[PDB]
């Protein structure tokens, strides 16, 4: 009945002076726009239908046409930035924000969805959505004693749209908007739905992806223990953002990093550093690299938790991008670590896999590895042990690889290598 209309049929119906014909044509547009294969968004826009859809959002008297137009506009806004812009340029933002108050849950939800798509376009529309006042009404939809009474899909859509208001940088969301949203995120982070948890973790990962003052806003809210708990979830869609968030947090201060350690994060890293999902291993190792860039007592907790053998493991065998993060973890470890900690690292077998990576066709990892070799030697001469160390490097082919690096197409590489070959070989 409303299936497979032409755009011109839709235009004809929406231009009739007949609200029911308009509703029928808007639903036909919605069904057109709801098919996964090549929805004719541009034809719909070119036909001038967005302003009509937007005007239909205001027809409180005809809630079906609000819903159908909200859904049509949601799917136009889900398209390209130009398509989202067409929706915004039609005045949809204030019209959707007004629909958040709709008594019809499926219309309110659709407006949530539409605003998520608009905000999800980028910082400017995100901030324009915020400036139009979306946050208060969005959070009010979550102002219930127990989130579990909300419809599952509705709560998921709200959490997702909130995460888009937290998303994107240059600029990051307004500080006041973040402070306004955070209490609700913290609460969603304790909800038991895996998708709400995933999107809540994504939102926190966005908010912690910035300067330490941004991290601090999040950490002050006490979420780190919950993020660590979610770090141990079985659902990869949860572990992924929880780990991103934790990784972001340990890019901050030593005190912020220490909150992650105190929360027990390190006990999860045996699994994370051996995780069969490549991106988990990579992000876990990146996280480790920023923990080993911290204080010596923080390095010591990496040690006590038995994570140095896991770093040796990653360095020995992993996706190359993960090995590069592991190399950073080692150079940070050796830059900041006591002599005893660096000795322990050698006793765990770091030398051989470090050496094997010096044959990487990647200039940055070579530099990183050479820094670490240098830092390990520095600790050796504090013990009169450079000879034992040099043998080790020779015993596993490392001396050969440091030799070839002297003649290498890069200043810092040839420099640091040549230095090693004479200061210790």
């Amino acid at each position: 009945g409303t299936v497979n209309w032409s755009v011109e049929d839709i235009v004809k119906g929406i231009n009739s002076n007949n609200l029911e014909s308009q509703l029928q044509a808007t639903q036909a547009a919605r069904k057109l726009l709801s098919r996964e294969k090549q929805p004719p968004i541009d034809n719909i826009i070119r036909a001038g239908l967005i302003p009509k859809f937007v005007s239909f959002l205001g027809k409180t008297d005809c809630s079906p046409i609000q819903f159908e137009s909200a859904w049509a506009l949601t799917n136009i806004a889900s398209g390209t930035s130009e398509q989202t812009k067409a929706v915004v340029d039609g005045g949809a933002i204030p019209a959707f924000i007004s629909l958040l108050a709709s008594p019809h849950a499926h219309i309110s939800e659709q407006a949530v969805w539409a605003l998520g798509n608009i905000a999800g376009d980028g910082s400017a529309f995100r901030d324009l959505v915020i400036k139009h006042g979306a946050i208060d009404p969005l959070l009010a939809l979550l102002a219930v004693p127990d989130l579990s009474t909300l419809a599952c899909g509705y709560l998921r859509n709200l959490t997702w749209t909130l995460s888009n208001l937290c998303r994107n940088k240059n600029p990051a969301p307004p500080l006041d908007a973040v402070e306004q949203i955070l209490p609700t995120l913290v609460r969603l982070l304790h909800h038991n739905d895996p998708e709400v948890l995933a999107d809540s973790c994504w939102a926190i990962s966005y908010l912690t992806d910035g300067p330490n003052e941004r991290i601090e806003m999040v950490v002050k809210k006490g979420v780190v223990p919950q993020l660590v708990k979610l770090l141990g979830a079985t659902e990869l869609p949860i572990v992924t953002p929880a780990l991103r968030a934790i990784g972001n947090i340990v890019t901050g201060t030593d005190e912020q990093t220490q909150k992650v350690i105190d929360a027990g994060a390190l006990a999860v890293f045996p699994s994370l550093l051996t995780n069969p999902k490549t991106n988990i291993q990579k992000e876990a190792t990146w996280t480790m690299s920023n923990i080993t860039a911290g204080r010596q007592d923080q390095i010591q907790q990496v040690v006590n938790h038995g994570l140095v053998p896991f770093l040796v493991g990653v360095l020995s065998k992993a996706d190359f991008k993960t090995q590069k993060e592991a190399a950073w973890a080692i150079t940070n470890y050796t830059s900041g670590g006591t002599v005893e900690q660096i000795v322990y690292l050698v006793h765990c077998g770091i030398i051989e896999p470090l050496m094997n990576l010096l044959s990487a066709k990647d200039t940055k990892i070579i530099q990183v590895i050479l820094d670490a070799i240098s830092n390990i030697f520095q600790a050796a001469e504090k013990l009169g042990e450079t000879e034992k160390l040099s043998i080790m490097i020779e015993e596993c082919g490392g001396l050969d690889k440091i030799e070839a690096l002297q003649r290498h197409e890069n200043e810092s590489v040839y420099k640091a290598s040549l230095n090693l070959i004479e200061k210790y070989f």
């Binding site: 709801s34 998303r167 690299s289 900041g336």
Partner: peptide, 13 residues
């Protein structure tokens, strides 16, 4: 020495 989800979703059903 520290170093530092679909955004848009159509409704199909």
């Amino acid at each position: 020495p520290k170093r530092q989800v679909l955004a848009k979703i159509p409704r199909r059903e």
